[PDB]
Design a protein around this ligand. Structure first.
Ligand SMILES: C[As](C)(=O)[O-]
Lengths: 113, 113
């Protein structure tokens, strides 16, 4: 039944560098950054993976992408960035709580893994 | 906005392998695939890049993520996949019309470019 590590970031049990918070979501820096700017946008609702989002999540999912781009701008990513959502094993999903990676501050390569 | 190659996919002047279409969006296979399954989810509203989405796009943005995961399921991506949105030069955004890449059918690496 126990929730993921992200539930303990959300309830502030685990210290994190939090960039933004509202009643729907939380934004915090990734502690294993893959770029000079690397942060995560997560819903408070513990959707485990994008494959398990439902129609009722439409507004929340749109809010997560708007918060990602608002936070990218606040972090100074004016020359481009990348949003990544990993689902399951082949996506290399680490924590089974929905998160959007935001990466910037270097040239991102193609393919994206 | 200037016409892009996506304008020619949307008006069906440029043939594509179209997986899904509704009032709000179009889904078609990427012609330079980076994985055995690689398709694009695009809005019909020509938002040039995620950095230029606005609050009024919330419902559309949520719809694009739900169509991405519904189409991933229809394409048999039950072992995981990756969603990628590129913004601007450092994101390696090729076409200035908002698109979500969906990649599956192989193990995606980390970092994601
Ligand atoms: C051919 As493309 C739209 O993945 O840069």
């Amino acid at each position: 039944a126990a929730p993921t590590i992200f539930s303990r970031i959300l309830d502030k049990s685990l210290p994190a560098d939090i960039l933004y918070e509202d009643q729907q979501c939380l934004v915090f820096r990734d502690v294993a950054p893959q770029a000079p700017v690397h942060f995560l946008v997560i819903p408070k609702k513990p959707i485990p993976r994008i494959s398990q989002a439902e129609e009722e999540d439409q507004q929340l999912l749109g809010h997560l992408l708007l918060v990602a781009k608002q936070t990218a701008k606040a972090e100074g990513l004016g020359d481009g960035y990348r949003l990544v959502i990993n689902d399951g094993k082949l996506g290399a999903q680490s924590v089974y709580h929905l998160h959007i990676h935001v990466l910037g501050g270097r040239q991102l390569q193609w393919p994206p893994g």
